[PDB]
Amino acid sequence: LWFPGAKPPAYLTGEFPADRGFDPLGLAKDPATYERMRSSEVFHSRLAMLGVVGSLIPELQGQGAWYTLSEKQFGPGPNGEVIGFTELALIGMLFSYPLEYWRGNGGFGWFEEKGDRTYPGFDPLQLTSEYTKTAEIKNGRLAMSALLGFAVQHATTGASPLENWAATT
Amino acid sequence: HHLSGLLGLGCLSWAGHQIHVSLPINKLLDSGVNPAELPLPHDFILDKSLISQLYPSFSKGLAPFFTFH
Amino acid sequence: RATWFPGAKAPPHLTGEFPGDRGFDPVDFAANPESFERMRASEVFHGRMAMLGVAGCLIPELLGRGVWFQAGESVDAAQLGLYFMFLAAPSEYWRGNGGFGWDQKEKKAGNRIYPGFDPLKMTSDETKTKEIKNGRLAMIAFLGLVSQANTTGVSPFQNLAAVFG
Ligand SMILES: CC1=C(C#C/C(C)=C/C=C/C(C)=C/C=C/C=C(C)/C=C/C=C(C)/C=C/[C@@]23O[C@]2(C)C[C@@H](O)CC3(C)C)C(C)(C)C[C@H](O)C1
Ligand SMILES: CC1=C(C#C/C(C)=C/C=C/C(C)=C/C=C/C=C(C)/C=C\C=C(C)/C=C/[C@@]23O[C@]2(C)C[C@@H](O)CC3(C)C)C(C)(C)C[C@H](O)C1
């Protein structure tokens, strides 16, 4: 459980993965809202795990920081197009319309789709298990914490998170 | 379907590619234009001035087609 | 019944039941009645958007703002586009889902074609037909706008002037 001297709140019964008995404000009260919650958790989780690495790795290679993505000119294109963060966001929203709709829909049709929407079918090595179902959520909770860490560390100090880690090592 | 679709539309589509991509690029290349400094094929579609220099009829656009001229 | 071509018979799946039905579905896109629902949704939406598109293109030019294809040279389109996508993305997700809810029974709840805004209460089948017939005419005119733009390179109203002189 999250806390040794804590008890599991009813609905949380250790059935679904990464259930470390934790819901103080009672937000997963109805078992159907816990469905949304679960899908949102694994979505936020996957995005964070992609965010941390996608914020550090360009920083390390020498491009910039988690911040300073604005005022960057993304460019040399095939016709010598140079565009700004706004145009890049617009691109990102245009190419995210159908992917997100299809993940929110369960499939492609105007009617009922049987399509999971939390753990879809993509495992060509058959590594899906309770261990891995747990490990994805756990790493992603960490990574969410880490991204909140990035934000507030840059908020208080004004330094890049590799420099703040070099001010502790 | 096989006559009108596969062969018919297939010929229309390929005439479309020829008119819009193969004819400019070959016309420029046959006048010794060094392929590195050739325009890319969409450039003939986006900028009608490029294709107008080569074939001026494009400046009249699709109006002749619809008035049977 | 009256049809889109003089002596043409209607397809059997088009029985006049729904508004706009003038017996035109040669490639049988709507033999399955679930696909006919989706297509009806799509036709009304494409329909509405083209009304706003055509009115967005003509009416400013009348009230001295400029030509519709020169619009992005007086605004910062990249910005606006991003805001437009930010207003759409919830709003179109709700329209698709049927309402706010991760459950699939949400799609059965509510109407995704005629959601029920009407405050002056004039929804009939003669008015549902009017939406669709204005819509189809706006779709056809939008294709005319783009085409004329490409061919003539000038204003749409200046293309109407050339008709009479
Ligand atoms: C569980 C529970 C509770 C709780 C809780 C908790 C702790 C919730 C926490 C929520 C949290 C922390 C959710 C964050 C997600 C982050 C996301 C989506 C990442 C996206 C971001 C991405 C994809 C990153 C993108 C970039 O890196 C890229 C690619 C390049 C960089 O240049 C720029 C940036 C950085 C933009 C209560 C409330 C305490 C009580 C209740 O009862 C039970
Ligand atoms: C029905 C049927 C068939 C069919 C068919 C046919 C004829 C289909 C035709 C469809 C057609 C012709 C559909 C047009 C839509 C146009 C839209 C959405 C317009 C604008 C949309 C917008 C929002 C405009 C935006 C702007 O303008 C604004 C507001 C201001 C400007 O400054 C900038 C821009 C331009 C961005 C078959 C296939 C033959 C057989 C089958 O069996 C049955």
Coordinates of C-alpha atoms in Angstrom, one line a residue, chain A residues 9-12 22-23 25-35 37-38:
Chain A
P9 CA -10.7 2.1 0.4
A10 CA -13.4 -0.5 -0.5
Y11 CA -13.6 -0.1 -4.3
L12 CA -9.8 -0.4 -4.5
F22 CA -4.7 5.1 -2.3
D23 CA -7.7 7.3 -2.8
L25 CA -10.5 12.3 -1.7
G26 CA -12.7 9.4 -3.0
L27 CA -12.5 10.2 -6.7
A28 CA -12.7 6.6 -7.9
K29 CA -16.0 6.0 -6.0
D30 CA -18.2 4.7 -8.8
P31 CA -16.6 1.7 -10.6
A32 CA -17.3 3.3 -14.0
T33 CA -15.5 6.5 -13.1
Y34 CA -12.6 4.3 -12.1
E35 CA -12.6 3.1 -15.7
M37 CA -9.6 7.3 -14.2
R38 CA -7.6 4.3 -15.1

